[PDB]
Structure formats: structure tokens, C-alpha cells
Amino acid sequence: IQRPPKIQVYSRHPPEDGKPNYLNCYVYGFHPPQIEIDLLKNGEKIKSEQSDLSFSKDWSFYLLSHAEFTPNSKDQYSCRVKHVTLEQPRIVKWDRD
Amino acid sequence: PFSFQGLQISSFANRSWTRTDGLAWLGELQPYTWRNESDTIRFLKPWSRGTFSDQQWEQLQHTLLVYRSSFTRDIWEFVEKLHVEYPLEIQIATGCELLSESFLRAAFQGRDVLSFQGMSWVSAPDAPPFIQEVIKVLNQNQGTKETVHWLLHDIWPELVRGVLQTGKSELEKQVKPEAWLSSGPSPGPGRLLLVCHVSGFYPKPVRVMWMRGEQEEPGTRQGDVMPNADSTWYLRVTLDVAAGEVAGLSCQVKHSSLGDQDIILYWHH
Ligand SMILES: CCCCCCCCCCCCC/C=C/[C@@H](O)[C@H](CO[C@@H]1O[C@H](COS(=O)(=O)O)[C@H](O)[C@H](OS(=O)(=O)O)[C@H]1O)NC(=O)CCCCCCCCCCC
Ligand SMILES: *[C@@H]1O[C@H](CO)[C@@H](O[C@@H]2O[C@H](CO)[C@@H](O[C@@H]3O[C@H](CO)[C@@H](O)[C@H](O)[C@@H]3O)[C@H](O)[C@H]2NC(C)=O)[C@H](O)[C@H]1NC(C)=O
Ligand SMILES: *[C@@H]1O[C@H](CO)[C@@H](O[C@@H]2O[C@H](CO)[C@@H](O)[C@H](O)[C@H]2NC(C)=O)[C@H](O)[C@H]1NC(C)=O
């Protein structure tokens, strides 16, 4: 009935400083389906795209956001997610290594 | 191997706000969507049309369209007449595997609620009391039951057969992953976390392992295989190990697109 979301963050391609890449934020296993997902660079939102909402056998929801990004060893990225089951928004950082 | 599956997500916030979106999967590719805004469905692939004629599609469209409006109206009326409280989340899943076996299942507030067996609406064993009223009203409308029967037994199968034929090549493409290694956060004292990333592979079945030469290493933790925007996959596999033992560890990747020629990545220092 109410399932909190699980959040995972990963790049499409091996992160090499300077090469254009894509940052993925996969949010899954949640219910109900209304959810806010933002991709962040040093705190600020960045232009992300988002796939259609879809769902698994047990009826939970899953969804993919991704954003074009160019990593360098300076900047940090994260995924911020808002859902009814969360008292406070949940931030998951992209860990390069 | 490749199942077809049609999905509906309906939400009713209150009596004034509602939305219904749909999509469908064939194996792991998404041929269609029907967004709330659209009066029609999107063919997301050049093979999405299958072998279905234009008149056949138009008919199916219209059927689905009437259904979407009628469905919405019917829920609202079931809510008023049965005093069920908002918000509501309703999910529907149909589809078939050719052996040919069709289903139409429904969930409410995230739990299985009813389905369509044979020619009847049947309540799930676990369903709340009031859906017995729903089932009753639904099993009265003969025309709907006939339209559902016809969809599941006549239309789904003929469709799936066609788009399997036209989507055959894109469905069974093989796409080689790229892969890399990294040093994750320390899991404790003198323990290190070695991470093996594999990304860009399609189809989804993949074996990824830590190793000493030919000896598979257990303590290898699988991550979840998760999607990429381009419908290829990503998988992260880790190992917990002591700083002395770092000697001669390799990650090894088996994938259908590689044949017998696996990808090996070595740790150095
Ligand atoms: C409290 C709620 C919680 C419970 C949640 C579960 C509820 C189950 C959901 C199932 C509800 C299905 C309701 C069916 C809606 C029907 O109104 C429509 C059309 O009804 C037709 O309207 C017709 C008149 O229409 S009008 O001229 O425009 O007014 C006729 O009355 C016709 O009867 S007939 O004897 O003449 O043939 C009648 O059936 N049922 C359908 O359209 C059936 C097709 C179902 C397609 C399912 C596909 C789902 C897959 C999702 C992928 C996008
Ligand atoms: C999902 O789709 C439904 C149905 O397509 C949307 O509801 C519809 O929205 C339209 C246009 O926005 C509404 O039009 C209204 O018409 C009346 C005329 O009497 C007028 O009072 C309003 O000013 C407006 O023009 C219409 O009420 C409504 N249609 C139905 C069948 O409910 C719905 O908003 C979409 N969902 C979301 C979240 O957008
Ligand atoms: C019905 O529900 C919808 C969606 O939940 C409500 O629309 C929102 O209402 C807030 C006010 O709290 C406004 O900021 C916007 O108008 C809407 N936001 C979103 C995210 O939709 C609507 O208020 C509700 N209608 C009634 C009569 O309760």
C-alpha cells in the first residue's frame, strides 16, 4: 500500500574527467506513484529527462531519470527524491569510485 | 521468451483531478505509450505497427479510447455509491505469452484486487469487502465481458504474433557492454571494497564475477541490474576483502553478446 522508494545513482559510461556522459538516477519499488526526482550538480538542479512510469510484478513502481553531464574531479552530483513516505527529501550522492 | 504486457496507471486525487497513462512492453522493449493528454497512442518503434492494418489499428484505438473515458466515469461512480476515500491508485496489467495464454489483472492501493477469468470478473482471494459490489456490477455488463474476451483471445495474440515478426531483429540484437573498476568506500578496518561496473549490455541476462584466475570468488555481492536511457543495462558487482589479500583479483564478465570471449579486468596496486 505504501512502499518507500529505493534509490540508485550511476553513470552510463566510465566516468573520465572531461568526457561527456550521462548520470542515471533509478528510483524503484515505491507506492503510490507520485514522486519528485531531481538530479543535482553542486546543489543546483540540472536538466534531466525522465522515462514513463512503469511497474513490477508486486505492483511497485519504478522510474528512470538521467541527465547529460561532464564529470571533473571538482564538481559533485546527487539525486534528490521527494515521496509521500519520506518525512524529509532523500538525497543520494553519486560516488565516482 | 519475450512476453507482451500492457500496463495502466490510473490516479484519482479527489473528485476533480485524475490521470490515466498506459504503456506496453515486448520482452524488455517498450513499443507503445498512451499518455493522458493524448487522444491516441504513440508507436515508439518503427515495428510497433506489427502486421496490423490501419483499419485494425483505428478500431483498437477507438475501443481503448471509449474504455478510458468510461473507465474514469465508472470509478467516480463506484466511489460515490460505495464511499471509498481518496486518494485512489488503480493499476491494470494484461498481456499474453504464446505457447497462447492471456491475462487481465488489477490492483487497488497497491494490492491485487480482481482479474478476468474465462468470461467472468473474479475477485482476488484477499480483496476488501466492497469490491464484491464492484465485481457484481461488472459481471452484469455483458458487452464489456465480450469485449474483454475478444481482446484477450482474439486481439492480443494476433497482435503479439505480428510485432514479434516485425520486431524480431531489434528484439534479438546483441549489444556489448563496456566495463570498469573502482575503489569504493572502506567497509571497515583494513577491509577494502572493490567495485566492478558493467554498463551498456543488452539483453538483460549477464553473469558478473570476482575471481582468482579461474576460481570464482564468493563474498561477491551482486547489485541490481538497472536500466539506461538507451534500453541497455548497468550492473555493479562488489567485493569485500583485506588490504594484504588484494593480490591478483580480477573481475570477469560473461554476456551473450561476447560469445565465449569474456571481458577480464584486473586490479593492479
Ligand atoms: C473502487 C475502485 C477500486 C477497484 C479497482 C479495480 C476496478 C476494475 C477496473 C475494470 C473497470 C472496467 C470498466 C469497463 C468500462 C466500460 O464502460 C467500457 C465500455 O462500456 C461499454 O459502453 C458501451 C456504450 O458506450 S458509449 O456508446 O460510448 O456510451 C455499451 O454500454 C457497452 O455495452 S454493450 O452491451 O452495448 O456492448 C459497454 O460494455 N468497457 C470497455 O470498453 C471494455 C474494453 C476494456 C479494455 C481493457 C484494456 C486495458 C489494458 C491497459 C493498456 C492501456
Ligand atoms: C487527463 O485527461 C482528462 C480527460 O481527457 C482531463 O480531464 C479533462 O480536462 C479537460 C481539458 O483540460 C476539461 O475541460 C473542461 O471542460 C469544461 C466544459 O464544461 C469546462 O468547465 C472547463 O473549463 C474545461 O474546459 C474536462 O473537464 C476534462 N474531461 C474529462 C472527461 O474529465 C484531465 O485533466 C487529464 N488529467 C490531468 C491530470 O490533466
Ligand atoms: C485535487 O487534487 C489535485 C492534485 O493533487 C490538487 O491540485 C493541487 O492543489 C495544490 C493546492 O494544494 C495547488 O498547488 C495545485 O493546484 C495542485 N498541485 C498539484 C501538484 O496538482 C487540487 O487542489 C485538488 N482539488 C480539490 C478540490 O481538492
Residue numbers in the entry:
A (entry chain B): 1 to 97
B (entry chain A): 7 to 105, 110 to 279
Article excerpt on this structure:
CD1 is a family of antigen-presenting molecules that is structurally related to major histocompatibility class I (MHC I) molecules, but binds and presents lipids, glycolipids and lipopeptides, rather than peptides. The overall structure of boCD1d is very similar to that of other CD1 or MHC I molecules, in which the boCD1d heavy chain is organized in 3 domains, α1 and α2 that form the central binding groove and α3, which non-covalently associates with boβ2M. The glycolipids are bound in the hydrophobic binding groove that can further be divided into the two main pockets, A and F. While the A pocket binds the acyl chain of each glycolipid, the F pocket binds the sphingosine, leaving the structurally distinct carbohydrate headgroups exposed above the boCD1d binding groove for immune recognition by cognate T cells. Secondly, the conserved disulfide bond in human and mouse CD1d that anchors the α2-helix to the β-sheet platform (Cys166-Cys102) is absent in boCD1d.
To address the question of why boCD1d does not bind bovine brain sulfatides to a measurable degree, we crystallized boCD1d in complex with synthetic C12∶0-di-sulfatide (di-SLF) and determined the crystal structure to a resolution of 2.9 Å. The asymmetric unit of the boCD1d-di-SLF crystal contained two separate boCD1d-boβ2M-di-SLF complexes that are very similar, especially in the presentation of the bound glycolipid. Our structural studies using a short chain C12-di-sulfatide finally revealed that boCD1d has a restricted A’ pocket, which in contrast to mouse and human CD1d, can maximally bind glycolipids with alkyl chain lengths approximating C18. The di-sulfo-galactosyl headgroup of di-SLF is presented in the for β-anomeric glycolipids typical upright orientation, between the α1- and α2 helices and stabilized through an intricate network of H-bonds that involve the core residues of CD1d (Arg79, Asp80, Asn151 and Thr154), as well as the polar moieties of the di-SLF ligand. The 3′-SO4 group contacts Asn151, while the 6′-SO4 group is bound through a water-mediated hydrogen (H) bond to Arg79. The ceramide lipid backbone is oriented inside the binding groove by an H-bond between Thr154 and the N-amide nitrogen, as well as by Asp80 of CD1d binding the 3″-OH group of sphingosine. A total of 6 H-bonds are formed between boCD1d and di-SLF (four with the headgroup and two with the lipid), which gives rise to ordered electron density for the headgroup. Overall, the orientation of di-SLF in the boCD1d binding groove, and the presentation at the opening of the groove is conserved with the presentation of sulfatide by mCD1d. Unambiguous electron density is observed for the galactosyl-di-sulfate headgroup and the C12∶0 fatty acid of di-sulfatide, while in case of C16∶0 -αGalCer, electron density is well defined for the entire lipid backbone but less well ordered for the galactose headgroup.
